[PDB]
Design a protein around this ligand. Sequence first.
Ligand SMILES: *C(=N)[C@H](C[C@@H]1CCNC1=O)NC(=O)[C@@H]1[C@H]2[C@@H](CN1C(=O)[C@@H](NC(=O)C(F)(F)F)C(C)(C)C)C2(C)C
Ligand SMILES: *C(=N)[C@H](C[C@@H]1CCNC1=O)NC(=O)[C@@H]1[C@H]2[C@@H](CN1C(=O)[C@@H](NC(=O)C(F)(F)F)C(C)(C)C)C2(C)C
Lengths: 303, 303
Amino acid sequence: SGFRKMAFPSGKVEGCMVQVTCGTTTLNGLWLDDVVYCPRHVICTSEDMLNPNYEDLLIRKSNHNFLVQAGNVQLRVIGHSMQNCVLKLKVDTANPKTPKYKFVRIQPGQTFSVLACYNGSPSGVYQCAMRPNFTIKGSFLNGSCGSVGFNIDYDCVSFCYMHHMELPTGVYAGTDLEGNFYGPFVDRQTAQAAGTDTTITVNVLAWLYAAVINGDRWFLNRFTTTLNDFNLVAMKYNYEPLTQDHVDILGPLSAQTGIAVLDMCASLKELLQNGMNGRTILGSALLEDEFTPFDVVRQCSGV
Amino acid sequence: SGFRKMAFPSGKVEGCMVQVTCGTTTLNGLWLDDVVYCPRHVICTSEDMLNPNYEDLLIRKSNHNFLVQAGNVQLRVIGHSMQNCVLKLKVDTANPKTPKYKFVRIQPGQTFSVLACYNGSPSGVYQCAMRPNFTIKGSFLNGSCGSVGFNIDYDCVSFCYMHHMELPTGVYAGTDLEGNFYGPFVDRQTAQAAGTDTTITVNVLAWLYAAVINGDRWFLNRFTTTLNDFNLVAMKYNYEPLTQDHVDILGPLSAQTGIAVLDMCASLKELLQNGMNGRTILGSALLEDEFTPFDVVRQCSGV
Ligand SMILES: *C(=N)[C@H](C[C@@H]1CCNC1=O)NC(=O)[C@@H]1[C@H]2[C@@H](CN1C(=O)[C@@H](NC(=O)C(F)(F)F)C(C)(C)C)C2(C)C
Ligand SMILES: *C(=N)[C@H](C[C@@H]1CCNC1=O)NC(=O)[C@@H]1[C@H]2[C@@H](CN1C(=O)[C@@H](NC(=O)C(F)(F)F)C(C)(C)C)C2(C)C
C-alpha cells in the first residue's frame, strides 16, 4: 500500500518540445510532423497584450519573422495559419520523433499529465485536473507559455491542453490544440473571472475507493443512502451532483472492494457533515478530488 | 502563483528501462552502457524469499538462465556479478540511449524523481523523498521491482535509488546502484522494523518560504526566536533538529523573501503549537516536508 499523485512518462512528449521566438516574446511550442503549435500571443509585445487585434498584428508578420529552435536545430518556417488562439507553423522538416498522437478536448473532472517547459526545454512534469470551471491549479511561471498536457494511451499521446495564461488568483487557463479555450477566457490581459469552482464528486469517491484498497478504512460508515439524499447534501458543500453514469464508472471499484457506491456516498455524506476531525486519509487531511476512477484503476491494478 | 509536487522529465530514463526474467520471477532492470542492473532477488522463487542464500542460489545460475528484454530486443548476457543486493549483467550491446550519468547515494531529506515500471515498461513518474528512517511512502505494486529514482542535473542523470521491497506498513526500501540498502534492511521476507520517522524540518521551512512567495502568508507571526528555543520545541513534535547548515541552505530564501530564517522558525513554532485550525497553506492542510530548499528554488525561479 501507498498511493501518490503520478504522471505519465514524458519522454514521448519531450521529443516534441521546441522554442518559438518572434521578436521580444519567446515561448514553447509543440512540433508534430511538419507543423509547430503554440499560443498565438507570441506575436505580441507586452504592450499589445493589453488589448490585441490578433489579425492586424499577425498581418504584419512573415514566416521569416519567426525563429523556431529545437535544442540547436533551426527550422525554416514556410507557412503560418492562426487557428483561434493557437498559431500553426509549417516547417521544412517533419519531426523525426513524432509519436502516434491525437488531439482531444477533455471534460471537467478529467486529469492529464503536464510537461512544463522554459524556452523549448522540459524542466518538469506533473499530473493535474481540469476544474469544473475550466481552470487548473498547477505551477507555471513566465516562459512556461506553450507547455502542454496530455494523456498516454499505451502507445498514443492524446494531447488535450496547451497553456496560455495565468489568472490573478494563481490558476491557469489555456486551449485544446485546435486553439479553443477551455472555459470563458480570452488571450488578453484584462480582469477575467475564474467563476465558482465545485468539487469533482465522482473523483472523491474514486479516491475513497483507493483508500479502502490501501488499508485506510476508518471512515467506513454504519449507514447507507439513496442518490437524491446525497446529491441534496452535495449541493450545500459545492459538490457536483452524481449521475447514474458516475455510478457506472465507479462500478469497477464497487466490484473490487465489494462496496456498493451508495454505501460510500453515505460514508462521504458523514465526512462532509462531520469534517475529518484531525485524522488523515491516505496521509492527506482533506478530500482529494483530482484522481479519476480511471486513474485509481490504472494504479490499483498495474498498467 | 500555484505550486505542486513536480518530477523531473523522465524521457532520459525511459531509454534505460529493460525487463529481466530468470525463471518464474521477472522484474525491471536498468541498462546502462553494456551493463544491466537489477535487484538480486530475481534469482529467487517466492519460496527462497523466506530466507535466501544469495550465493548458493546464484551459484546454480549461468548467463543463459537470464532473459533480458528491451521492448522486443534481446540481449545476450555474457557475465554476471552480484554486488551486494544488486545484480550486474554484462551484455553484447551497449545501450545506444545511455545518457550522461553518475551513481550517487543521497541523504535523508533529499528528494528525487521515480519512474515506476512493470515488466520493462514505464507506467508512471512521481517525485518523492528519502525519509529520515531511510524509507519512502510512494506507490509500488508487484512488478515495479527494479524501478529507479534519480535526479537530473541539466544533462546528467544522477541515479540514487533502485526499488527492492515493501514493508508491512506500505512504505518502501531499496538500494543505491552499488546495491547497498538505504537503511537497516535486507532482501528477505521477514518481519523488519521501519523505525520511528521524523519530519524533515529544513524542507518544511522551505515549503513555507514557497508559500509566502505564492501569496499564502496568513501564518506570518508577530514574533521571532533563537535556534535552541525552536529546536527544543522541534524535539517534542518529532522534527529533525536544525543545524547552521540548514540555515545557510535556506539563506537564498531569506534573501528572496527578505525574511530571516528564525522569523520563519518562529512562525513554525506557533503553527506547531497552535495547529492549523482548519485553514489551508498552499491548499494542503498539513505541513508538507518533501520539498527541499533546492526544490523550492528550482520552481521559484525557472530552471
Ligand atoms: C506565460 N507563461 C504567461 C502566463 C503566466 C505569467 C506568470 N505565470 C504564468 O504562467 N502568459 C501571459 O503573460 C498571460 C497571457 C495574457 C496575460 N497573461 C497573464 O498570465 C496575466 N493574466 C491575465 O491577463 C488574465 F487574463 F488571465 F487575467 C497576468 C496578469 C500576468 C497574471 C497574455 C500575455 C496573452
Ligand atoms: C516487488 N516490487 C516487491 C515489492 C512489493 C510487493 C507489493 N508491492 C511492492 O512494491 N518485492 C518483494 O516481493 C519484496 C522483496 C522481499 C519481500 N518483499 C516484500 O515487499 C514483502 N516485504 C517484506 O518481506 C519486508 F521485509 F519488507 F517486510 C511483502 C510481505 C510482500 C510486503 C522480496 C521478495 C525479496
